[PDB]
Amino acid sequence: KTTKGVQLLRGDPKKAIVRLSIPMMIGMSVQTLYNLADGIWVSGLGPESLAAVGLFFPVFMGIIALAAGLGVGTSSAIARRIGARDKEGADNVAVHSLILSLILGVTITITMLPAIDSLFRSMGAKGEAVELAIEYARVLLAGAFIIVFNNVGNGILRGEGDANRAMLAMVLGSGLNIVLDPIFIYTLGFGVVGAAYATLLSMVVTSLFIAYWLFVKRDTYVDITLRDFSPSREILKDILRVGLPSSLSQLSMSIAMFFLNSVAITAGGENGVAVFTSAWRITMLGIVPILGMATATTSVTGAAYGERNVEKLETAYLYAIKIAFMIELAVVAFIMLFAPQVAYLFTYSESAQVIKGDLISALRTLPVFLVLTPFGMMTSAMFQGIGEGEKSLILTIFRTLVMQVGFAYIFVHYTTLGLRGVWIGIVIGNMVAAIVGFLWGRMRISALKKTSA
Numbered sequence: 176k177t178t179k180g181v182q183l184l185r186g187d188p189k190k191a192i193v194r195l196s197i198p199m200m201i202g203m204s205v206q207t208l209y210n211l212a213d214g215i216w217v218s219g220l221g222p223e224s225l226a227a228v229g230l231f232f233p234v235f236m237g238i239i240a241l242a243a244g245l246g247v248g249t250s251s252a253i254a255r256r257i258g259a260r261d262k263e264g265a266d267n268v269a270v271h272s273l274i275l276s277l278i279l280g281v282t283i284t285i286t287m288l289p290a291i292d293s294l295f296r297s298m299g300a301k302g303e304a305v306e307l308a309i310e311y312a313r314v315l316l317a318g319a320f321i322i323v324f325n326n327v328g329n330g331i332l333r334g335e336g337d338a339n340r341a342m343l344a345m346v347l348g349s350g351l352n353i354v355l356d357p358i359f360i361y362t363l364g365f366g367v368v369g370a371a372y373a374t375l376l377s378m379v380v381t382s383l384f385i386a387y388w389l390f391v392k393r394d395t396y397v398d399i400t401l402r403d404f405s406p407s408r409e410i411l412k413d414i415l416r417v418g419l420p421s422s423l424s425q426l427s428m429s430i431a432m433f434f435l436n437s438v439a440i441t442a443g444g445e446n447g448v449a450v451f452t453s454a455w456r457i458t459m460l461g462i463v464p465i466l467g468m469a470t471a472t473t474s475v476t477g478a479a480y481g482e483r484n485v486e487k488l489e490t491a492y493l494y495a496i497k498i499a500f501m502i503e504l505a506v507v508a509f510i511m512l513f514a515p516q517v518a519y520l521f522t523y524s525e526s527a528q529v530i531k532g533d534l535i536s537a538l539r540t541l542p543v544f545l546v547l548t549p550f551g552m553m554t555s556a557m558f559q560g561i562g563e564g565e566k567s568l569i570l571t572i573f574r575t576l577v578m579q580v581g582f583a584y585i586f587v588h589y590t591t592l593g594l595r596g597v598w599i600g601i602v603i604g605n606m607v608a609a610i611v612g613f614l615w616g617r618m619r620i621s622a623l624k625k626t627s628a
């Protein structure tokens with residue numbers, strides 16, 4: 176009466192990390208290929224049409240930070256019960272989270288829909304760029320509960336080791352969205368608002384398959400049934416303890432990106448922001464694989480934390496850092512060698528402004544930080560696995576807003592490095608946060624050996 180995702184989740188910690196990471200890397204690859212190709216479609220629409228997405232993109236990131244945030248907290252809570260062999264509790268958590276996905280998604284829609292016209296006019300935009308963004312937001316905000324349900328539902332699969340179907344749910348939504356984008360935007364001539372319907376229909380098809388697995392097939396490990404009674408303020412707090420900080424982590428990382436561009440303004444003008452933007456867009460080739468192992472670390476370490484197997488937890492937390500470090504080592508060495516080739520496809524295709532000199536030198540300096548992020552992300556994933564999610568938020572605020580932002584402000588205003596000193600500061604800043612992250616992790620690991628012995 177045990178599923179294969181669960182049996183894999185409770186088994187070998189080293190095997191569970193590899194087996195649950197590879198599906199998550201593939202799913203986010205399709206999500207990255209969507210976001211990559213979508214920009215190529217929307218940019219070829221016009222000037223005031225490209226600004227309409229720019230006004231809504233922060234609103235989109237905010238909703239995703241809430242949906243995926245609630246998804247991470249749900250996945251962790253279910254993973255700890257399954258580790259503790261508390262299926263009745265893991266069932267109650269799955270029902271609790273699905274009820275929250277309905278409450279949260281409706282709250283996002285009733286809140287945002289009024290405060291849209293006043294929000295998009297705050298940046299001073301007016302006319303077509305505002306009216307398009309208002310219509311573009313009216314589409315994706317009408318189906319907010321689908322975005323939350325798709326994230327919570329995907330988290331219920333990852334919580335019980337079902338990373339396979341949790342990957343399929345991602346490739347189904349993003350795959351259709353890659354296909355539906357040029358058809359709705361160009362072939363049918365819907366325009367920029369067509370990209371909001373391609374996303375909506377894609378997430379609608381995904382929601383049906385998730386609901387088909389959770390309520391019709393019911394082949395998941397958890398029993399999602401409202402038949403009995405168990406409203407738990409304890410479970411509600413346990414889900415939100417990882418949920419709310421994970422959302423604020425995305426906000427903290429976002430605010431940190433806003434300051435780095437303002438430092439890139441002072442460092443090397445306006446295209447220095449474009450060189451900066453084109454630089455970290457390339458580093459997504461390395462951030463995506465880590466995000467995969469981050470989702471697997473949370474469910475594996477949480478499964479060990481629920482099983483009260485601290486050695487299994489530590490063996491998993493260290494193995495996740497070692498594997499991620501070697502995958503980035505290959506990614507960094509690949510991007511750093513063929514850097515003039517990666518920039519060739521990123522800046523010279525548009526002969527409107529050549530910025531190959533600064534982007535190439537940044538690709539030999541910035542991707543150095545990709546080998547240090549596993550020390551901070553696996554730590555954040557391990558704090559989320561054991562439930563102590565506020566520690567992941569503290570580690571993120573220190574890494575982004577303090578170390579990376581601080582080292583970039585100092586290496587520009589108080590040195591002669593200039594624009595290249597921005598990438599120097601982010602690497603050195605992330606390097607100091609790697610020490611703090613990796614040490615905080617192993618320090619938290621030992622505290623649980625004391626509590627159990």
Ligand SMILES: [Cs+]
Pocket residue numbers: 210213
């Ligand atoms: Cs988008």
Ligand SMILES: [Cs+]
Pocket residue numbers: 317
């Ligand atoms: Cs509607």
Ligand SMILES: [Cs+]
Pocket residue numbers: 393394395396397398399
């Ligand atoms: Cs079941």
Ligand SMILES: [Cs+]
Pocket residue numbers: 587588589590
């Ligand atoms: Cs200066």
